[PDB]
Structure formats: C-alpha cells, structure tokens
Amino acid sequence: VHRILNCRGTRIHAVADSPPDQQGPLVVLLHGFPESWYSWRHQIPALAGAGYRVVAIDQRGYGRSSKYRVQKAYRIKELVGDVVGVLDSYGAEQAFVVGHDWGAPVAWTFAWLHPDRCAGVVGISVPFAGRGVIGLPGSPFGERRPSDYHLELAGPGRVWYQDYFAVQDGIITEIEEDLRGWLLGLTYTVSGEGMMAATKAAVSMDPIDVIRAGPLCMAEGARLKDAFVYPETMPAWFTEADLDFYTGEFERSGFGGPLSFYHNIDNDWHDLADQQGKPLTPPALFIGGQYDVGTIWGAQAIERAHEVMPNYRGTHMIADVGHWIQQEAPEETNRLLLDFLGGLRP
Amino acid sequence: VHRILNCRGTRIHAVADSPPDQQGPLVVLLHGFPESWYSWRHQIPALAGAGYRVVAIDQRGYGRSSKYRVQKAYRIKELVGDVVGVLDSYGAEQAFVVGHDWGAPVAWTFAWLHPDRCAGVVGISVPFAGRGVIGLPGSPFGERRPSDYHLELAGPGRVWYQDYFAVQDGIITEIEEDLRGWLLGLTYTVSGEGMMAATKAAVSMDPIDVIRAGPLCMAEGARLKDAFVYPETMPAWFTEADLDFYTGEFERSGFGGPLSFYHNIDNDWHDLADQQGKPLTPPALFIGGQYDVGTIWGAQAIERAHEVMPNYRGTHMIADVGHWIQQEAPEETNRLLLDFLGGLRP
Numbered sequence: 119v120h121r122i123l124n125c126r127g128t129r130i131h132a133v134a135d136s137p138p139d140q141q142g143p144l145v146v147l148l149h150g151f152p153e154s155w156y157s158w159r160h161q162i163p164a165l166a167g168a169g170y171r172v173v174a175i176d177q178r179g180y181g182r183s184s185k186y187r188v189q190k191a192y193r194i195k196e197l198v199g200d201v202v203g204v205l206d207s208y209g210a211e212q213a214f215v216v217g218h219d220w221g222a223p224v225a226w227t228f229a230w231l232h233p234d235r236c237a238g239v240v241g242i243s244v245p246f247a248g249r250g251v252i253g254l255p256g257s258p259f260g261e262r263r264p265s266d267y268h269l270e271l272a273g274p275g276r277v278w279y280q281d282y283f284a285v286q287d288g289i290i291t292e293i294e295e296d297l298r299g300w301l302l303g304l305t306y307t308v309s310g311e312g313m314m315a316a317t318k319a320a321v322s323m324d325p326i327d328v329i330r331a332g333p334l335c336m337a338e339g340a341r342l343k344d345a346f347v348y349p350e351t352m353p354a355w356f357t358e359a360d361l362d363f364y365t366g367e368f369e370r371s372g373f374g375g376p377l378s379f380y381h382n383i384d385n386d387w388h389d390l391a392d393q394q395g396k397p398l399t400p401p402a403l404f405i406g407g408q409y410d411v412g413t414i415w416g417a418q419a420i421e422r423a424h425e426v427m428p429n430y431r432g433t434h435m436i437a438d439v440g441h442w443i444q445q446e447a448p449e450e451t452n453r454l455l456l457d458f459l460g461g462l463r464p
Numbered sequence: 465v466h467r468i469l470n471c472r473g474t475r476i477h478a479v480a481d482s483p484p485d486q487q488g489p490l491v492v493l494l495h496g497f498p499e500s501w502y503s504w505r506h507q508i509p510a511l512a513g514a515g516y517r518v519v520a521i522d523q524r525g526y527g528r529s530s531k532y533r534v535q536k537a538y539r540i541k542e543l544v545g546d547v548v549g550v551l552d553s554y555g556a557e558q559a560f561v562v563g564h565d566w567g568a569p570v571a572w573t574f575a576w577l578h579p580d581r582c583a584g585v586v587g588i589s590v591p592f593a594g595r596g597v598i599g600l601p602g603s604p605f606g607e608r609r610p611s612d613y614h615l616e617l618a619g620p621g622r623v624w625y626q627d628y629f630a631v632q633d634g635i636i637t638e639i640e641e642d643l644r645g646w647l648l649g650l651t652y653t654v655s656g657e658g659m660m661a662a663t664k665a666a667v668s669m670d671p672i673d674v675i676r677a678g679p680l681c682m683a684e685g686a687r688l689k690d691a692f693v694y695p696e697t698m699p700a701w702f703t704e705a706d707l708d709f710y711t712g713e714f715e716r717s718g719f720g721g722p723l724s725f726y727h728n729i730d731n732d733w734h735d736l737a738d739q740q741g742k743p744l745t746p747p748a749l750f751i752g753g754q755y756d757v758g759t760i761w762g763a764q765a766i767e768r769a770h771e772v773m774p775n776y777r778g779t780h781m782i783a784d785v786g787h788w789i790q791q792e793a794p795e796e797t798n799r800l801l802l803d804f805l806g807g808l809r810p
C-alpha cells in the first residue's frame with residue numbers, strides 16, 4: 119500500500135490500493151494545504167472497491183516526499199510534472215485526476231496542459247481558475263495580478279493571509295509555538311460547524327467585502343492564529359487520532375515546502391499566461407461545499423465553468439459542509455466521484 | 465522515553481532515560497550533520513545505567529523538532545538557546561553537555577556563554593574553535609573569515625563542500641534523486657573503513673593541501689555525490705536498519721534546516737566576535753578519531769586546547785575510527801564519557 123516513486127529525480131511517496139488483480143483505471147488523488155495522502159483515507163477503499171487503481175500522494179514538500187528549499191521547486195508546472203511522473207511510474211497513458219484545495223489547481227493545470235494524459239479531472243473546493251490558480255470574488259480567472267488584487271482591494275491596514283503565508287517567517291513562527299493546536303484551530307475555523315458557528319453569531323451584503331471582516335483577513339502586525347476558533351470537543355469527522363496523524367506529519371516535514379506553494383502564486387500566474395484562452399478539454403467536474411471558502415470565493419469562476427471547459431460534466435454542491443469536503447462528507451464525495459468515473463471511459 | 469519540549473516557542477523533540485527514581489545529573493546529547501537523537505542510541509542506556517538523566521534531542525530543523533525556513537533561525541546562539549530551553553524544561557540549573565559534529569560547536573558555545581549552567585562539556589569530532597565554529601588547518605579559532613579562507617586557499621577551480629552546502633540548491637537536488645543512497649555514500653566515505661580504504665589506495669605531505677584532492681573538495685560544477693564511495697556490504701556498525709531509520713527521518717524532514725546550519729557559519733563567526741579572547745571555563749573534554757576529518761582539520765585547535773580552556777581535562781583519540789565516532793566506537797566512547805562525568809560534581 120505504501121509506495122516510493124521517483125521516475126525523474128523527485129521522490130514522491132504514496133498510498134495505493136486496487137483490486138487484487140492490480141488492474142483498472144488509474145485514479146490519482148492530490149491533497150491540499152495543510153494536508154496529506156491521509157486526507158483521502160475515506161476515498162481510497164471505495165475507489166479500490168469499485169475496481170480502480172487508486173494512488174494518493176504526498177505532494178513535494180509534504181509528508182515523505184522530497185523537500186526542496188528553493189522557491190522555484192514549488193511552481194505550478196513542477197507540481198504538475200510530479201503528477202506526470204506518477205503516471206509514468208505506473209506506466210499509465212491516461213489517468214483520472216482528483217484534486218482538493220491546492221491539489222485542485224494542480225489537477226486542473228494537469229488537464230489543461232496534458233489532455234492526452236487525462237481521462238478526466240475533478241477539482242474539489244477550488245474551481246478551475248485558469249492562470250489565476252485560485253478564483254476570487256474579483257478575479258475568477260486571474261484577470262488582475264494575484265498579489266496586486268490582494269494588497270489593494272482587500273484591506274486598508276489589513277493583510278491577505280496568502281501574502282502572509284508567502285513571507286514564510288511570522289507564519290511559521292506562529293505555527294511552531296504550538297503546531298498541534300494550530301492545525302486544530304485552522305481545521306475547525308474553516309470547517310462546516312466552525313463556519314456555521316461564526317455565522318450563528320449573526321449579531322448578507324456584498325461578497326467582495328465578506329472576505330474582509332473574515333477570519334483570513336488579518337490586521338497588519340497580528341497573527342492569523344489570533345482569529346482561530348477552537349471546538350469544545352473534537353468534531354465527529356475530525357478525531358483526536360486524525361489530528362495526531364497530521365500533527366505527526368508536519369512536525370517532521372515543517373510548513374516551508376507547503377507555504378512555498380503560496381509564495382509562487384504570482385509566478386504561476388505568469389507561467390500560465392501562454393495558456394490563457396485555450397480551453398480545458400478533458401471531462402471535468404467540480405465539487406463544492408456550501409460553507410467552503412474555496413467554493414464561495416470561486417463563485418464567479420463556477421458560474422463561468424462551461425465557458426472554459428467545453429466538456430464540463432457539472433457543478434455539485436454538498437450542503438452543510440465547509441472546506442475539508444472529502445473529510446466532512448466522505449460518502450457523499452465518494453458517490454459523486456464514483457458516478458463521474460463510472461460514466462467515463464478509461 | 466519520547467518527549468516533546470517547548471519552553472519558549474520552539475518545539476524540541478527528544479528521547480530521554482534515567483534511573484526509575486528519575487534522579488541524577490542531567491546529560492544532554494547533541495547530534496551533528498546529518499544525524500539525529502538516534503546517533504546516541506548506544507550511549508543513552510549506558511548513561512542512564514550509570515545513574516544519569518540522559519536527554520538526546522533532535523536539533524531544530526531535524527527529526528520532529530520545529531522546522532524554520534528563515535536563515536536567522538539557524539544561527540549559533542539560537543541553537544544554543546534551544547539547549548538552555550532543554551535545561552529549563554527539566555528545571556536543571558546545570559547540565560553536562562555532549563556534542564558531536566555540528567552538535568559540538570553548539571555544546572562548546574553553550575559552555576562558553578553559559579558557564580553558570582554547565583557542569584562540564586564534551587565535544588566529539590569537532591574540537592573547540594572559538595568564533596571559528598569549526599577549526600581548520602589554517603584557522604583553528606576563526607582567525608580569518610570562514611567563507612574567505614574557503615574560496616581562496618582551498619582550490620583554484622574547485623569548491624569547498626561547506627559553501628556548496630550553504631547554497632542549498634544543487635546540494636538538495638543531488639540528495640533528493642536518491643536520499644537513502646546519499647546517506648549510505650556520505651556515511652561510508654568519511655567512516656573509518658571508508659577512509660582507510662581510500663588511503664589503502666596509496667598509489668604524507670602538507671595537511672593544508674590534503675583537504676584538497678580530498679572527497680569534500682569538489683570541482684566547480686560537479687556533484688559532491690560524485691566522490692562518494694559505497695561499501696559492497698553494510699558495515700558492522702552501521703546496519704540496514706540504522707540506515708532505514710535515518711532515511712525515514714530525512715525524507716520527512718528534508719535537509720533545508722540542517723544545511724542552514726552551514727549557511728550561517730560566517731554569520732556565527734560574526735555573532736561570536738564579542739566573545740573572542742574570553743576563556744571557556746567549565747570542565748572541558750574532547751574526543752577525536754584517528755581518521756575523522758573533524759579531528760584532523762582541527763589538529764591546531766587541539767594542540768592549543770589548554771590555552772583557551774583553562775580547565776581542559778584532556779584530548780582522547782580513538783584509533784581506527786572515522787567521523788561517526790560514537791557510532792563507530794560506542795563502548796570506547798561510553799568509557800570516556802563515563803570517566804569524565806564520573807570524576808565530576810553535578
């Protein structure tokens with residue numbers, strides 16, 4: 119089940135499974151921030167049980183995969199290259215690729231640049247946003263420069279969490295003081311029950327400024343950790359044991375690699391300009407969450423899905439769940455994936 | 465036995481042991497590059513058995529301890545601060561501190577700056593080199609600037625491995641292509657049997673240029689890995705299981721943190737100028753290895769040991785062993801430590 123791949127110089131660790139005959143359409147699962155192959159624990163057995171060869175990797179910088187320090191190692195095309203390397207290790211011509219959160223842009227771009235290797239693509243939480251990487255209330259497909267739109271048009275004397283993440287200084291310092299607690303905080307805050315709670319504190323007007331006054335919109339000089347909300351008890355879907363696993367992965371891997379993903383957003387935006395316009399042709403699908411910030415911020419990109427993906431197979435919304443979609447609604451997510459993959463030809 | 469310390473914002477993981485009454489002089493073991501608390505596996509039980517509270521940590525950037533990205537987190541005083549934090553967690557006023565390789569300058573500097581917290585200090589492989597951090601054939605106590613002496617006076621069109629390590633680009637890339645193999649290579653090359661082998665290839669003249677034409681002296685553009693020597697079989701002291709452990713630690717931690725230690729050598733040299741001259745007063749001891757590059761390069765600093773450490777208790781040389789001293793000669797190392805600590809007052 120545990121595999122160590124390294125087709126072209128980069129070590130990629132993974133957890134695989136499939137029918138005993140080890141035959142069936144290859145399905146690659148790409149996790150987001152700050153997660154791991156473990157975020158797909160509820161999907162792996164279902165996918166393998168339906169007859170698919172499922173491969174859940176640790177992206178570079180995460181878990182047991184190669185940890186690079188230089189910023190250029192975390193640019194979008196490199197991430198996409200790793201996926202290509204995964205298929206070449208299994209000797210697969212085509213593959214179904216599913217990505218959640220940061221894994222999404224990587225899955226989307228993989229489909230964008232390598233349609234000949236993609237039997238279909240599914241993005242979760244973060245909808246296809248072209249050179250933009252992640253669609254926002256103002257820029258669904260990276261119309262304006264990422265960092266620019268952040269600074270101006272997001273807060274007077276405040277700071278966009280992504281720019282903070284990119285600095286890789288204060289952010290890591292705040293995490294290291296108490297990493298287990300930080301994960302718990304972040305996880306709960308953007309989770310369904312966490313978001314519905316914050317809302318329950320009522321006391322509807324312009325989404326563009328809803329991001330502001332939001333948990334991820336901090337005041338220059340403060341700590342993101344300062345806006346976290348902690349549960350009195352561990353949610354039913356995210357148990358103590360799960361938290362110990364993630365904590366274990368990150369106090370060993372650190373957040374340097376993961377955060378570098380963010381550091382390159384602008385760079386990615388630039389690297390993908392030569393693709394702007396061209397459509398994404400493999401069969402595509404998007405799974406969103408009612409209270410997921412990703413789904414929300416990407417509303418406009420979603421509305422214009424069919425415009426850029428001529429073979430879009432639909433937008434699916436999972437009610438009463440937040441950001442950690444495949445973890446917050448594993449069975450519903452499984453049904454959706456299984457339906458998508460089942461109606462397709464490997 | 466496994467402990468998670470965090471007295472002041474930095475997570476430090478460790479493996480501890482002691483008599484059941486959990487009482488006795490505190491002994492802190494500091495590992496080097498690229499090692500872990502595991503490098504002291506043969507010492508922990510002996511020290512605990514003799515009645516000492518032994519604590520073997522993972523320095524920052526290693527194993528399960530906090531992984532910082534910024535360069536300033538890996539400067540000498542920060543490393544030393546972590547040690548201080550270790551004693552405060554056990555509430556110990558004084559402690560015996562043993563350091564091998566990179567752990568040595570940290571143990572030495574700890575004694576240098578905090579004599580009031582040090583019952584005694586032991587450096588292994590790397591002898592006390594003042595603001596120099598690591599003594600060299602030319603500069604035993606950091607007489608000339610570290611990087612300067614490297615460039616000029618070390619190779620025409622060649623490059624000093626430490627400067628390469630500091631760049632943190634090519635070095636990591638070469639490692640990631642095959643990390644398990646890299647560790648095996650590095651470990652064997654500078655090991656006793658590896659060094660005696662290279663020498664057996666005879667075919668004595670100026671040590672200053674012996675470093676050159678050496679394995680750690682590479683030609684600009686080449687890979688350090690290019691000069692490695694691999695054993696036909698695993699040495700008796702460094703087994704497959706040990707290698708799997710180290711491999712496991714590093715493909716999770718990466719080398720970014722460890723390498724940053726090197727990146728700050730010059731900076732350290734600068735940070736410790738305000739200490740130049742002042743003597744190191746706690747009871748000190750040095751353990752060297754006949755074929756250890758550390759012991760060899762630090763020959764001059766060794767000859768002048770009593771000059772800077774008025775309470776030096778002696779230089780000890782372990783024959784027929786290379787760089788990995790406490791691993792290559794665990795029992796001999798244990799006897800030496802036990803003798804040193806036994807004749808002292810906690």
Ligand SMILES: O=C(Nc1ccccc1)Nc1ccccc1
Nearest residue numbers: 151219220223244251252308441
């Ligand atoms: O910001 C997040 N993701 C992201 C993915 C691709 C491009 C840019 C950003 N995730 C996130 C997840 C949980 C809490 C906060 C943010």
Ligand SMILES: O=C(Nc1ccccc1)Nc1ccccc1
Nearest residue numbers: 497565566569590597598654787
């Ligand atoms: O270079 C090494 N150590 C060191 C420690 C303190 C300051 C500067 C350098 N170790 C080393 C160990 C094995 C192989 C090669 C180098």
